[PDB]
Design a protein around this motif. Structure first.
Motif, short mmCIF file in Angstrom:
data_model
loop_
_atom_site.label_atom_id
_atom_site.label_comp_id
_atom_site.label_asym_id
_atom_site.label_seq_id
_atom_site.Cartn_x
_atom_site.Cartn_y
_atom_site.Cartn_z
N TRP A 41 -14.30 0.54 0.93
CA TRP A 41 -13.31 0.06 1.89
C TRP A 41 -13.67 -1.29 2.48
CZ3 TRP A 41 -11.97 -0.52 7.19
CH2 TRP A 41 -10.60 -0.39 7.45
N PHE A 64 -11.34 -0.15 16.84
CA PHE A 64 -11.98 -1.43 17.09
C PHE A 64 -11.52 -2.03 18.42
CE2 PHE A 64 -12.39 -6.04 16.51
CZ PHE A 64 -13.71 -6.14 16.12
N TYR A 65 -10.20 -2.15 18.60
CA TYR A 65 -9.69 -2.72 19.84
C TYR A 65 -10.03 -1.85 21.04
CZ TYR A 65 -7.25 -6.51 17.50
OH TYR A 65 -6.96 -7.64 16.78
N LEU A 74 -12.01 -12.99 24.07
CA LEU A 74 -12.42 -12.13 25.17
C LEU A 74 -13.58 -12.77 25.94
CD1 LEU A 74 -12.08 -8.52 23.80
CD2 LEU A 74 -10.48 -9.94 25.08
N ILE A 134 -15.72 -2.45 26.32
CA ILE A 134 -16.85 -3.34 26.58
C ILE A 134 -16.46 -4.41 27.59
CG2 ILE A 134 -18.35 -5.06 25.53
CD1 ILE A 134 -18.35 -3.20 23.03
N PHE A 170 -8.32 2.15 12.02
CA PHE A 170 -9.48 1.29 12.19
C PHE A 170 -9.26 0.28 13.29
CE2 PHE A 170 -10.86 -3.05 11.27
CZ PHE A 170 -12.22 -2.92 11.45
N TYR A 171 -8.11 -0.40 13.28
CA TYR A 171 -7.86 -1.38 14.32
C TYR A 171 -7.76 -0.74 15.69
CZ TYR A 171 -7.80 -5.69 11.83
OH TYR A 171 -8.18 -6.81 11.13
N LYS A 218 -4.97 4.29 7.44
CA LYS A 218 -6.38 3.94 7.54
C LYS A 218 -6.57 2.63 8.30
CE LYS A 218 -8.43 6.15 3.52
NZ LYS A 218 -9.58 6.12 2.57
N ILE A 219 -5.74 1.63 8.00
CA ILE A 219 -5.87 0.34 8.67
C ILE A 219 -5.49 0.45 10.15
CG2 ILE A 219 -3.59 -0.71 8.24
CD1 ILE A 219 -7.06 -2.33 7.73
N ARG A 244 0.82 -1.20 0.00
CA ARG A 244 0.00 0.00 0.00
C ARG A 244 0.86 1.26 0.00
NH1 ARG A 244 -4.48 -1.26 4.37
NH2 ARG A 244 -4.40 -3.55 4.27
N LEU A 280 -13.46 -2.76 22.01
CA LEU A 280 -13.42 -4.10 22.59
C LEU A 280 -13.00 -4.04 24.05
CD1 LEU A 280 -11.71 -6.73 20.22
CD2 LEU A 280 -13.95 -6.79 21.22
#
Ligand SMILES: *[C@@H]1O[C@H](CO[C@@H]2O[C@@H](C)[C@@H](O)[C@@H](O)[C@@H]2O)[C@@H](O[C@@H]2O[C@H](CO)[C@@H](O[C@@H]3O[C@H](CO[C@H]4O[C@H](CO)[C@@H](O)[C@H](O)[C@@H]4O)[C@@H](O)[C@H](O[C@H]4O[C@H](CO)[C@@H](O)[C@H](O)[C@@H]4O)[C@@H]3O)[C@H](O)[C@H]2NC(C)=O)[C@H](O)[C@H]1NC(C)=O
Ligand SMILES: CCCCCCCC/C=C\CCCCCCCC(=O)OC[C@H](COP(=O)(O)OCC[N+](C)(C)C)OC(=O)CCCCCCC/C=C\CCCCCCCC
Ligand SMILES: CCCCCCCC/C=C\CCCCCCCC(=O)OC[C@H](COP(=O)(O)OCC[N+](C)(C)C)OC(=O)CCCCCCC/C=C\CCCCCCCC
Ligand SMILES: CCCCCCCC/C=C\CCCCCCCC(=O)OC[C@H](COP(=O)(O)OCC[N+](C)(C)C)OC(=O)CCCCCCC/C=C\CCCCCCCC
Ligand SMILES: CCCCCCCC/C=C\CCCCCCCC(=O)OC[C@H](COP(=O)(O)OCC[N+](C)(C)C)OC(=O)CCCCCCC/C=C\CCCCCCCC
Ligand SMILES: CCCCCCCC/C=C\CCCCCCCC(=O)OC[C@H](COP(=O)(O)OCC[N+](C)(C)C)OC(=O)CCCCCCC/C=C\CCCCCCCC
Ligand SMILES: CCCCCCCC/C=C\CCCCCCCC(=O)OC[C@H](COP(=O)(O)OCC[N+](C)(C)C)OC(=O)CCCCCCC/C=C\CCCCCCCC
Ligand SMILES: CCCCCCCC/C=C\CCCCCCCC(=O)OC[C@H](COP(=O)(O)OCC[N+](C)(C)C)OC(=O)CCCCCCC/C=C\CCCCCCCC
Ligand SMILES: C[C@@H]1O[C@@H](O[C@H]2C[C@@H](O)[C@]3(CO)[C@H]4[C@H](O)C[C@]5(C)[C@@H](C6=CC(=O)OC6)CC[C@]5(O)[C@@H]4CC[C@]3(O)C2)[C@H](O)[C@H](O)[C@H]1O
Ligand SMILES: *[C@@H]1O[C@H](CO)[C@@H](O[C@@H]2O[C@H](CO)[C@@H](O)[C@H](O)[C@H]2NC(C)=O)[C@H](O)[C@H]1NC(C)=O
Ligand SMILES: CC(C)CCC[C@@H](C)[C@H]1CC[C@H]2[C@@H]3CC=C4C[C@@H](O)CC[C@]4(C)[C@H]3CC[C@]12C
Ligand SMILES: CC(C)CCC[C@@H](C)[C@H]1CC[C@H]2[C@@H]3CC=C4C[C@@H](O)CC[C@]4(C)[C@H]3CC[C@]12C
Ligand SMILES: CC(C)CCC[C@@H](C)[C@H]1CC[C@H]2[C@@H]3CC=C4C[C@@H](O)CC[C@]4(C)[C@H]3CC[C@]12C
Ligand SMILES: CC(C)CCC[C@@H](C)[C@H]1CC[C@H]2[C@@H]3CC=C4C[C@@H](O)CC[C@]4(C)[C@H]3CC[C@]12C
Ligand SMILES: [Mg+2]
Ligand code: NA
Ligand code: NA
Lengths: 40, 294, 993
Positions: C986, B32-33, C833, B39, B28-29, B24-25, B17, B36
């Motif tokens: 995407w 997301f994490y 998890l 929560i 995003f991660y 961007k990746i 890339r 996670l």
């Protein structure tokens, strides 16, 4: 309660196993029913 | 392949890339994490809100109390030479670590220690398991009570001349009341003499019938001179409600021990709410392999 | 076995004389060889029998199945497990036997998978052996001047051999004297019609000359003599079979995909191992422990159950094919059809029926079409006019062929008929729409006839008239339309008669060119009523002088005929072209017929044009037109012999509808190689021996079952036992369906890898009690998980699969990074998890709060510490805390099953939603039910905490993984939503597998 509070350290694992087995058996049966429902 | 998929100079790509893609990746991660983790933390906080601070909800996996001792044996064996001093050091070090908690300097004043009957007595209830009354009070247990195994006279505790000691202890359980066997016609042989109701008896013997003769004089030391645990040191209210609490101890001297031979000694406590297990060799009883080779 | 000398095109000594031939091999043209000399040569070089194929013991193929690519990975895993066990045994005391159990389990898994795959290939081999029917055959040889019939294995080179219509040519003969002897060169040279064998030489190509008989060919009609030129394996088809056997096999696409999959799995496994090895060394552990950690992580990152799942998936798709009469010899050859993008087909025996049939008929100035389909499923030709009746009488009478005795059972088209092909087709058509010809022939007694002369080129005969009111005589002749046209002056129109004015003569010329341009062979039937006043009922018309009026006859109509294609051939070709599969015709037949069959089956779409067609439409030379304006091209074999590699590449690169005509088997192989050189998958469909070198080198061979040859049947990979061409379409569809299903099943079996490795990683880094035991990982990977992964194969299509273009091999793989990002990155993380959540809950309810668990492993494991203080101050012995840890393993395994529910539901569909597709897959439902029943049974059955170490759970724990499962469902549901609304966004280039 007080001195004779022996129940505070007992659990009826026997009855629990009996119920869990009845449930497992029922689920297995239902599964078989669904699988063969159509070939008859 | 090898070189291109690593760095090309026409599309200005690295690993595949461009510059903005790895960003961007990664972003995003990261989001997301992060969600996670938040929560999982919330679902663990509701759990912390579901438990009580003064009592364990489930107490069935620790119903029959264990029986541990002061020396730390690797395979439940006590082997040491009466000549080489660097042989029983690992034992004395442990023993000392255990007795170092019963120092009189630690037990001082009215709070939180209270002087209790010098002779075995009955239970003592300091109320319920609440925070209404402040920190409860625990009975004092003096070192000197153990006569020849106290590290106050002969620091080594015995191991110096072929007369080792073994400080036995009952596993601390919250709200556990020890109950001894009654005087009825059914009772073991040993227990008949000195039936102090208020004392939980502890008695050692030989695993095999042969070893009997090779074992000498089991001399027990304890509260009041009896071979047991006084019921007055129970029940245990838990760390939170009874910090600075001391559990009774019982010393056992194995005098007149045959030299140069492995002896299997099994110690056992007797009582109603006490039950042994063929799988756990520390539930109620315990085994020791002493061998004073000199 | 020099392959290059076998790759070259056949050479010969045909261009010689009878004296030069007899002088080179040694043989009397009128007396043949002597018995002593015959035996001297028989022992000098060997019997005239092909060498048997290279046998194969059963233990060899069983060892083959025990190895491979996946099984080798499992083999190295077992070896590593035993190595780690040996280490732990030599370094410490009380070595846990976990590693040994895992190793014997992996070995058993590999053995079972090998047994199953081997049993399937053996089943196919047995049903394949039930087809080779070899009846001994004896030839007629002339020695010392006498005729004798000896076994085919006793014929040598030089003796004289005689053949008769109905027998098989033993060896490669050199015809010396023939009597109207025709031969069937369909299997070897692919010539649909019977080429006459004459002693004279005609063409420089040995396959085209008529003075050479070939091995395995049959003499249709006539008798001939010849000198054995080639014998044994040295024959033409002997060299072809030896070349076929001396070719490599290759490596299917599914195997390459599995290989690249193992490559990725091992990459991430050795990466996580070397990384946690350096990390463990940086935290203090010793070398002895770090090595075990490395081996444990590498072995843990290996899908053990995926092997049995993949094998069952492929077997499931194979049984359906076997239900529709499509049998595969191997197991992976079921997917190659779906990945094919260029199908090279054969004409004679594959695209056609290899049987002459009456196609078109002319009568009443109107062209009529007849049904030329095997099962007779079409349109009639209006059998209501008298003209047709007269035509039926002419054809049924002026014909000498008759059905072979004892065919009362077979159908009207598949029965054996003794005679020429044209007369056989005529007899079959009359027996088809005119009833029993035997009664039609006995209803009119044939008085005098006349065979097929090379001058008269016409067959005539007179018979009595069955009219009970007319005792006259009937005369019927048949022959070439020009000769018959020059002998008539009337025309039977709608029953009545009319003159032969130039109007109908021109309509007859246009009809002749219409039926001729269609690649068919047309004949003309005419008759005449002889006046009983000039030829009474008693006068005998001896065939000596002109007793019948040659001219002034009554022409009734033309009758064409040609070999028609199989029923489902056009539809199947159209279906293949719709799926983006390039259809290229490759046959050794005449180009004039190959082009017609190509246009009739769909290879050359109607409207496209060749350079010659343009030059003919414009009336200009061919060297002027540009070859780029021609989409379809007909490449002749003679021209193919003189073409470079680049020229062939350009031929396939610029022409979309290619037809290779007059191509030899070696040229067929060259064409297949020219197609592979670019990078596309190839599927060759054939029937004869000329297709053997093409079926072997192609990525996948399809041989016909009934009309196919034994050599091509043994060298092919897929057999069509019913000779139905639609099976190719069914196969190309199944090959895709099982590909998308393999992707889904792989993502399912890979998602669980994370919640099975994270516990050990947190065990080493955070020093917490072991969360997931080894017998639980085994109960998950080889237990519950198996049924759902197997069920994922029964998933139906989402969109039309027969519409999308073929998958690109260089870009669209089977296991890409988009899958790893989902299984290892998003779903597996949530499952891990959830497992840790149930873990902490179980330990918090018994007294060990999360704050006191970090840093306890040293004392939590120690076997001599019978007093472990918990968060509340209680003292726990060793066995009691171990019992709690085991209960945590049981709850972790059940949490895994709970999250696997939503993983199997989100894996059911890759793009579509669950509320669209639907839960119509009963196997998946049964999988979920069984997956839950097994976990409940393993936990509640008495004696499990002793055998497998799994304690019962309290009804409140079973609900700790539910929120994570629903969250997984919601996340994947919204994921499969932006892909639909936003095509190409995407989420598609990042999470669309
Ligand atoms: C609980 O009580 C422990 C014992 O208390 C002693 O006895 C009670 C009844 C009271 O009288 C109390 O006042 C006593 O102290 C107590 O442990 C003791 O702690 C002291 C202080 O460190 C130790 O003294 C040192 O002894 C070493 C050598 O020890 C030898 O013997 C022991 C066994 O007793 C072995 O384990 C050793 O390996 C040795 O073989 C001396 O070298 C050291 O020298 C230091 O002091 C001198 C001046 O005297 C200086 O010149 C030096 O530079 C050094 O600074 C000390 O003399 C004593 O050994 C130790 N007893 C035991 C049995 O270990 C313990 O700490 C108390 N714990 C709590 C929580 O209250
Ligand atoms: C479409 C797909 C259909 C799928 C259907 C699958 C079939 C399900 C099969 C069985 C489930 C029913 C189980 C009932 C078992 C009750 C047995 C029982 O006696 O159990 C008591 C325990 C309390 O244990 P304790 O520890 O307190 O005491 C322990 C005391 N000692 C140990 C001392 C004895 O209680 C328990 O186990 C609680 C049992 C769990 C409660 C069920 C919760 C249901 C959750 C969602 C369903 C909602 C449906 C809404 C309808 C919508 C219609 C449109
Ligand atoms: C087409 C239609 C198909 C239909 C098929 C239907 C199949 C039948 C369906 C259900 C059958 C139910 C049977 C119930 C059995 C109850 C047994 C039981 O409750 O035993 C409990 C006790 C053990 O208690 P403990 O004190 O040791 O506890 C430990 C205490 N601690 C550890 C704290 C000290 O038992 C004992 O002592 C003695 C135990 C003796 C051995 C009993 C064998 C039971 C094992 C398996 C049967 C279950 C199969 C169910 C089907 C599942 C399919 C997947
Ligand atoms: C106690 C704690 C627990 C720890 C648990 C860890 C669990 C491990 C979980 C996942 C393992 C991740 C390992 C890496 C996986 C990468 C996947 C991969 O290698 O798949 C292979 C693909 C090939 O794909 P293809 O066949 O479609 O190619 C076709 C190319 N044609 C067609 C153009 C020729 O190759 C590629 O993707 C190219 C290779 C890209 C490699 C990227 C490496 C990124 C790794 C770490 C980054 C960390 C940075 C963190 C700092 C962030 C800044 C704040
Ligand atoms: C808090 C707890 C969290 C738990 C998270 C995990 C959840 C995972 C478990 C279950 C999820 C259930 C999801 C429900 C989806 C329903 C979708 C549905 O209903 O879509 C309707 C479809 C579409 O129909 P169409 O228009 O295409 O028809 C055309 C017919 N023509 C062609 C004749 C016109 O209709 C059809 O699919 C046909 C009818 C199919 C009926 C299926 C009923 C069975 C559903 C679930 C089985 C239960 C598994 C339980 C596992 C636990 C074991 C102990
Ligand atoms: C469509 C076709 C449908 C077919 C469905 C088939 C379903 C079959 C359903 C049930 C059969 C299961 C096997 C039954 C096992 C009975 C075991 C039993 O009754 O044990 C009772 C005694 C326990 O006595 P205690 O309480 O005095 O012990 C006290 C020990 N203390 C005090 C030292 C701790 O046992 C002992 O002593 C020794 C225990 C021996 C351990 C045997 C367990 C076997 C281990 C693994 C096999 C499981 C594989 C999973 C297969 C799944 C198939 C679907
Ligand atoms: C289609 C659906 C299939 C569903 C089935 C689930 C698949 C299961 C997959 C993997 C599980 C197999 C793992 C085998 C575990 C063996 C464990 C073992 O050997 O432990 C050894 C223990 C020793 O323990 P210790 O040192 O604490 O003793 C101390 C004794 N002291 C202290 C008193 C002296 O000895 C003992 O437990 C003695 C009792 C021996 C128990 C053997 C149980 C074997 C269980 C399964 C094998 C058969 C499975 C075949 C099915 C395949 C399905 C595809
Ligand atoms: C216990 C377990 C809990 C797990 C909970 C997980 C919740 C976290 C879910 C989502 C958070 C991730 C959001 C990341 C947003 C930043 C990503 C970003 O920077 O994106 C940029 C692109 C816009 O660039 P472009 O395409 O225009 O450029 C074209 C460039 N070229 C050519 C490369 C395509 O963004 C786009 O496309 C828009 C795509 C945005 C991604 C939507 C994904 C939504 C997935 C799940 C949300 C549902 C949660 C339901 C939970 C219920 C709990 C009860
Ligand atoms: C630090 C170390 O911790 C303990 O040992 C540890 C290493 C080793 O002993 C084992 C048993 O061999 C490992 C084994 O290696 C790898 C596994 C089989 C692995 C896999 C699952 C799978 O599916 O594939 C691989 C996950 C963990 C695992 O299941 C076991 C778990 C028990 C353990 O015991 C843990 C001991 O207490 C030891 O004394 C102390 O030094
Ligand atoms: C301690 O054991 C010793 C034996 O090791 C006992 O002394 C022995 O007594 C016998 C007589 O029964 C004599 O024959 C031996 O010579 C004695 N040996 C020694 C070393 O004295 C002794 O009685 C035991 N004492 C106690 C209190 O158990
Ligand atoms: C279709 C979906 C949403 C249904 C989900 C059903 C879930 C909640 C069912 C499936 C199996 C069930 C458990 C199976 C076994 C036992 C043991 C038994 O002795 C008490 C009930 C208990 C504890 C059940 C509680 C509810 C349970 C987990
Ligand atoms: C829907 C999702 C993404 C929301 C996740 C919200 C997360 C970040 C929220 C949910 C519960 C929250 C925690 C719950 C409890 C406590 C204890 C309190 O004394 C301080 C705040 C603290 C430490 C919170 C920090 C933020 C937290 C973890
Ligand atoms: C919609 C989503 C975000 C709601 C998630 C709700 C979470 C916080 C709920 C779902 C299941 C719940 C747990 C399930 C089981 C138990 C065991 C029980 O003996 C005490 C409560 C306890 C420990 C619960 C705590 C709260 C919990 C984790
Ligand atoms: C235990 C915890 C802290 C580990 C967290 C590891 C995370 C950050 C790892 C696990 C899987 C990884 C991703 C998995 C797949 C891909 C695709 C690849 O072509 C580039 C790297 C990329 C995009 C990775 C980025 C980093 C990643 C998300
Ligand atoms: Mg053919
Ligand atoms: Na695994
Ligand atoms: Na092949």
């Amino acid at each position: 309660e007080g001195p004779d509070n022996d129940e505070r350290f007992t659990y009826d694992y026997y009855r629990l196993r009996v119920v869990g087995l009845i449930v497992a058996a029922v689920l297995c049966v239902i599964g078989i029913i669904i699988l063969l429902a159509g070939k008859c | 392949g090898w070189k291109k998929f690593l760095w090309d100079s026409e599309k200005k790509e690295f690993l595949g890339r461009t510059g903005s893609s790895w960003f961007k990746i990664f972003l995003f991660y990261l989001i997301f994490y992060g969600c996670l983790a938040g929560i999982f933390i919330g679902t663990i906080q509701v759990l912390l809100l579901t438990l009580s601070d003064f009592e364990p909800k489930y107490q069935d996996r620790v119903a029959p109390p264990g029986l541990s001792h002061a020396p730390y044996a690797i395979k439940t064996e006590i082997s040491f030479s009466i000549s080489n001093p660097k042989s029983y050091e690992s034992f004395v070090k442990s023993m000392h670590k255990l007795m170092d908690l019963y120092n009189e300097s630690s037990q001082a004043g009215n709070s939180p220690f209270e002087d209790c009957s010098d002779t075995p007595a009955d239970y003592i209830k300091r109320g319920d398991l609440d925070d209404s009354q402040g920190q409860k009070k625990a009975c004092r247990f003096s070192r000197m009570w153990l006569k020849n195994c106290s590290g106050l006279d002969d620091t080594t505790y015995g191991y110096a001349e072929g007369k080792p000691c073994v400080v036995a202890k009952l596993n601390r359980i919250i709200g556990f009341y020890p109950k001894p066997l009654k005087n009825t016609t059914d009772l073991p042989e040993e227990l008949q003499a000195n039936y102090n109701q208020y004392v939980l008896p502890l008695r050692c013997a030989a695993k095999r019938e042969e070893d009997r003769e090779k074992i000498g004089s089991i001399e027990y030391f304890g509260l009041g001179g009896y071979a047991g645990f006084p019921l007055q040191y129970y029940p245990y209210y838990g760390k939170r409600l009874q910090k600075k609490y001391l559990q009774p101890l019982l010393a056992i001297q194995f005098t007149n021990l045959t030299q140069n031979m492995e002896l299997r000694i099994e110690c056992k406590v007797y009582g109603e709410n006490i039950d042994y297990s063929e799988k756990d060799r520390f539930r109620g009883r315990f085994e020791v392999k002493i061998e004073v080779k000199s | 076995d020099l392959d290059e000398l076998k790759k070259e095109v056949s050479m010969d000594d045909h261009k010689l004389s009878l004296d030069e031939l007899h002088n080179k091999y040694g043989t009397d043209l009128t007396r043949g060889l002597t018995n002593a000399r015959a035996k001297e040569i028989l022992a000098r070089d060997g019997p005239n029998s092909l060498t048997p194929p290279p046998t194969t013991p059963e233990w060899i193929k069983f060892c083959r199945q025990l190895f491979g690519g996946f099984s080798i990975l499992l083999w190295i895993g077992a070896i590593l497990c035993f190595l780690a066990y040996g280490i732990q045994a030599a370094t410490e005391d009380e070595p846990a036997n976990d590693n040994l159990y895992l190793g014997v389990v992996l070995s058993t898994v590999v053995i079972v998978t090998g047994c199953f795959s081997y049993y399937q290939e053996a089943k196919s081999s047995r049903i394949m052996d039930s087809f080779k029917n070899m009846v001994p055959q004896q030839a007629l040889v002339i020695r010392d001047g006498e005729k004798s019939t000896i076994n085919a294995e006793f014929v040598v080179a030089g003796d004289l051999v005689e053949v008769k219509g109905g027998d098989r040519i033993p060896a490669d003969l050199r015809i010396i004297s023939a009597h109207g002897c025709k031969v069937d060169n369909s299997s070897l040279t692919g010539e649909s019609e019977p080429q006459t064998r004459s002693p004279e030489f005609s063409s420089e190509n040995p396959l085209e000359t008529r003075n050479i008989a070939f091995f395995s060919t049959n003499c249709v009609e006539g008798t001939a003599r010849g000198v054995v030129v080639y014998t044994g394996d040295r024959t033409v088809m002997g060299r072809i079979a030896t070349l076929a056997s001396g070719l490599e096999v290759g490596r299917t696409p599914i195997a390459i995909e599995i290989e690249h999959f193992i490559h990725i799995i091992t990459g991430v496994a050795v990466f996580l191992g070397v990384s946690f090895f350096i990390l463990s060394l940086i935290l203090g552990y010793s070398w002895l422990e770090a090595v075990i950690f490395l081996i444990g992580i590498i072995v843990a990152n290996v899908p053990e159950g995926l092997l049995a799942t993949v094998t069952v998936c492929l077997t499931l798709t194979a049984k359906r094919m076997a239900r529709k009469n499509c049998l595969v010899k191997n197991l992976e050859a079921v997917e190659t059809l779906g990945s094919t993008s260029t199908i090279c087909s054969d004409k004679t025996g594959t695209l056609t029926q290899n049987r002459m049939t009456v196609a078109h008929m002319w009568f009443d100035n109107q062209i009529h079409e007849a049904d030329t389909t095997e099962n007779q499923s079409g349109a009639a030709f209006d059998k209501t006019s008298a003209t047709w009746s007269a035509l039926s009488r002419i054809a049924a009478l002026c014909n000498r062929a008759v059905f072979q005795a004892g065919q009362d059972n077979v159908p009207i088209l598949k029965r054996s008929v003794a005679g020429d092909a044209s007369e056989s087709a005529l007899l079959k058509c009359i027996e088809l729409c005119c009833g029993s010809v035997q009664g039609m022939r006995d209803r009119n007694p044939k008085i005098v006839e006349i065979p097929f002369n090379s001058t008269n080129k016409y067959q005539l005969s007179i018979h009595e008239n069955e009219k009970s009111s007319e005792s006259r005589y009937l005369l019927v002749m048949k022959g070439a339309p020009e000769r018959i046209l020059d002998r008539c002056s009337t025309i039977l129109l709608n029953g009545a008669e009319e003159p032969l004015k130039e109007d109908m003569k021109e309509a007859f010329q246009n009809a002749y060119l219409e039926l001729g341009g269609l690649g068919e062979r047309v004949l003309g039937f005419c008759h005449f009523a002889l006046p009983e006043d000039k030829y009474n009922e008693g006068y005998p018309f001896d065939a000596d002088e002109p007793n019948f009026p040659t001219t002034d006859l009554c022409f009734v109509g033309l009758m064409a005929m040609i070999d028609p294609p199989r029923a489902a051939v056009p539809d199947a070709v159209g279906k293949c072209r719709s799926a983006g599969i390039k259809v290229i015709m490759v046959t050794g037949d005449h180009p004039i017929t190959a082009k017609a069959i190509a246009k009739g089956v769909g290879i050359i779409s109607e409207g496209n044009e060749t350079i010659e067609d343009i030059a003919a439409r414009l009336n200009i030379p061919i060297g002027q037109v540009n070859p780029r304006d021609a989409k379809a091209c007909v490449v002749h074999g003679s021209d193919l012999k003189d073409l470079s590699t680049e020229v062939l590449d350009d031929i396939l690169h610029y022409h979309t509808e290619i037809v290779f005509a007059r191509t030899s088997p070696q040229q067929k192989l060259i064409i297949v190689e020219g197609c592979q050189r670019q990078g596309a998958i190839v599927a060759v469909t054939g029937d004869g021996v000329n297709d053997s070198p093409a079926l072997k080198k192609a990525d996948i061979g399809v041989a016909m079952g009934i009309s196919g040859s034994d050599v091509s049947k043994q060298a092919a990979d897929m057999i069509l036992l019913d000779d139905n061409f639609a099976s190719i379409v069914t196969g190309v569809e199944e090959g895709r369906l099982i590909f998308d299903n393999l992707k889904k099943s792989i993502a399912y079996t890979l998602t669980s890898n994370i919640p099975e490795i994270t516990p050990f990683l947190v065990f080493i880094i955070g020093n917490v009690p072991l969360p997931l035991g080894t017998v639980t990982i085994l109960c998950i990977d080889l237990g519950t998980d198996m049924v759902p992964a197997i069920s994922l194969a029964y998933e139906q299509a989402e969109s039309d699969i027969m519409k999308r273009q073929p998958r690109n091999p260089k870009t669209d793989k089977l296991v890409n990074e988009r899958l790893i990002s989902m299984a290892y990155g998003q779903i597996g993380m949530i499952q891990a998890l959830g497992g840790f959540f149930s873990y902490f809950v179980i330990l918090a309810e018994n007294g060990f709060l999360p704050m006191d668990l970090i840093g306890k492993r040293v004392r939590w494991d120690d076997r001599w510490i019978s007093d472990v203080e918990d968060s509340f101050g209680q003292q726990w012995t060793y066995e009691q805390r171990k019992i709690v840890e085991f209960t945590c393993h049981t709850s972790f395994f059940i949490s895994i099953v709970v999250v696997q529910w939503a993983d199997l539901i989100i894996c059911k569909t890759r793009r579509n939603s669950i509320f669209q597709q639907g839960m119509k897959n009963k196997i998946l439902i049964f999988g979920l039910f069984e997956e839950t029943a097994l976990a409940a049974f393993l936990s509640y059955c008495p004696g499990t905490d002793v055998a497998l170490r799994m304690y019962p759970l309290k009804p409140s724990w079973w609900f700790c993984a539910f929120p994570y499962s629903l969250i997984i469902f919601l996340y994947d549901e919204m994921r499969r939503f932006i892909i639909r609304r936003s095509p190409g966004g995407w989420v598609e280039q990042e999470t669309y597998y």
